[PDB]
Design a binder for this molecule. Structure first.
Ligand SMILES: [Mn+2]
Length: 108
DNA sequence: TAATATTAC
Protein backbone atom coordinates (compact mmCIF):
# COMPACT_ATOMS: atom_id res chain seq x y z
CA UNK A 1 0.00 0.00 0.00
CA UNK A 2 1.39 3.38 -1.11
CA UNK A 3 -0.02 6.94 -1.12
CA UNK A 4 1.84 10.24 -1.56
CA UNK A 5 -0.51 13.08 -0.73
CA UNK A 6 -0.90 16.38 1.07
CA UNK A 7 -4.55 15.71 2.03
CA UNK A 8 -6.03 12.48 3.35
CA UNK A 9 -9.67 11.37 3.47
CA UNK A 10 -10.19 8.56 5.98
CA UNK A 11 -13.27 6.43 6.72
CA UNK A 12 -13.49 4.14 9.77
CA UNK A 13 -16.55 1.86 9.51
CA UNK A 14 -17.96 0.15 12.61
CA UNK A 15 -15.95 2.49 14.81
CA UNK A 16 -17.01 3.26 18.39
CA UNK A 17 -14.31 5.83 19.22
CA UNK A 18 -15.61 9.28 20.00
CA UNK A 19 -14.65 11.90 17.45
CA UNK A 20 -12.55 13.68 20.09
CA UNK A 21 -10.70 10.49 21.00
CA UNK A 22 -9.97 9.74 17.34
CA UNK A 23 -8.85 13.33 16.80
CA UNK A 24 -6.57 12.96 19.80
CA UNK A 25 -4.90 9.81 18.48
CA UNK A 26 -4.42 11.30 15.00
CA UNK A 27 -2.88 14.47 16.45
CA UNK A 28 -0.32 12.35 18.28
CA UNK A 29 0.72 10.38 15.17
CA UNK A 30 4.41 11.01 14.66
CA UNK A 31 4.66 11.94 10.98
CA UNK A 32 7.62 13.65 9.30
CA UNK A 33 5.53 16.55 7.92
CA UNK A 34 3.30 18.63 10.18
CA UNK A 35 -0.48 18.31 10.33
CA UNK A 36 -2.13 21.66 9.64
CA UNK A 37 -5.78 20.53 9.92
CA UNK A 38 -7.72 17.55 11.26
CA UNK A 39 -11.50 17.26 11.08
CA UNK A 40 -13.30 14.21 12.48
CA UNK A 41 -17.02 13.52 12.22
CA UNK A 42 -19.24 10.82 13.69
CA UNK A 43 -22.03 9.40 11.49
CA UNK A 44 -24.27 6.32 11.70
CA UNK A 45 -24.46 3.31 9.41
CA UNK A 46 -27.88 2.17 8.19
CA UNK A 47 -27.93 -0.36 11.07
CA UNK A 48 -27.35 2.32 13.73
CA UNK A 49 -23.64 1.51 14.15
CA UNK A 50 -21.37 4.58 14.20
CA UNK A 51 -18.45 5.30 11.91
CA UNK A 52 -16.00 8.18 11.53
CA UNK A 53 -14.74 10.28 8.64
CA UNK A 54 -11.49 12.26 8.83
CA UNK A 55 -9.88 14.95 6.74
CA UNK A 56 -6.17 15.43 7.44
CA UNK A 57 -4.30 18.23 5.69
CA UNK A 58 -0.50 17.96 6.03
CA UNK A 59 1.91 20.87 5.61
CA UNK A 60 3.60 19.02 2.76
CA UNK A 61 2.99 15.82 0.85
CA UNK A 62 3.12 12.76 3.09
CA UNK A 63 4.23 9.40 1.74
CA UNK A 64 2.07 6.72 3.34
CA UNK A 65 3.98 3.44 3.13
CA UNK A 66 1.84 1.22 5.34
CA UNK A 67 -1.86 0.37 5.20
CA UNK A 68 -2.11 0.34 9.01
CA UNK A 69 -0.45 3.69 9.78
CA UNK A 70 -3.84 5.26 10.53
CA UNK A 71 -5.25 2.39 12.58
CA UNK A 72 -6.77 3.58 15.85
CA UNK A 73 -7.18 1.80 19.19
CA UNK A 74 -9.86 1.87 21.88
CA UNK A 75 -10.22 -3.40 19.69
CA UNK A 76 -8.48 -1.96 16.61
CA UNK A 77 -10.04 0.29 14.01
CA UNK A 78 -8.89 0.14 10.41
CA UNK A 79 -9.79 2.89 7.91
CA UNK A 80 -10.29 3.23 4.21
CA UNK A 81 -7.38 5.49 3.20
CA UNK A 82 -7.64 7.75 0.17
CA UNK A 83 -5.92 10.90 -1.01
CA UNK A 84 -8.50 13.68 -0.96
CA UNK A 85 -9.27 14.67 -4.55
CA UNK A 86 -10.87 17.90 -3.29
CA UNK A 87 -10.13 19.12 0.21
CA UNK A 88 -13.14 21.43 -0.01
CA UNK A 89 -15.50 18.65 -1.16
CA UNK A 90 -14.31 16.43 1.70
CA UNK A 91 -14.54 19.26 4.24
CA UNK A 92 -18.17 19.72 3.25
CA UNK A 93 -18.82 15.98 3.22
CA UNK A 94 -17.38 15.51 6.73
CA UNK A 95 -19.48 18.41 8.04
CA UNK A 96 -22.83 17.45 6.56
CA UNK A 97 -24.48 15.69 9.54
CA UNK A 98 -23.30 18.24 12.10
CA UNK A 99 -21.31 16.13 14.59
CA UNK A 100 -17.69 17.05 13.93
CA UNK A 101 -14.60 18.52 15.61
CA UNK A 102 -11.68 20.50 14.10
CA UNK A 103 -8.02 20.92 14.94
CA UNK A 104 -5.81 23.50 13.26
CA UNK A 105 -6.52 25.75 10.28
CA UNK A 106 -8.09 24.65 7.00
CA UNK A 107 -5.53 24.90 4.18
CA UNK A 108 -5.50 26.80 0.85
C1' DT B 1 -3.36 -0.61 -3.64
C1' DA B 2 -5.07 -2.89 2.37
C1' DA B 3 -8.44 -4.02 4.76
C1' DT B 4 -12.15 -1.97 7.35
C1' DA B 5 -16.73 -2.46 5.32
C1' DT B 6 -21.93 -0.28 2.54
C1' DT B 7 -18.95 3.21 4.68
C1' DA B 8 -15.55 6.01 1.80
C1' DC B 9 -15.17 13.60 -2.33
MN1 LIG C 1 -20.83 8.50 6.66
Amino acid sequence: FKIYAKNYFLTYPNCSLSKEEALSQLKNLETPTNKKYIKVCRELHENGEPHLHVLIQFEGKYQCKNQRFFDLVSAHFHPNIQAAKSSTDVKTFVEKDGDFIDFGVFQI
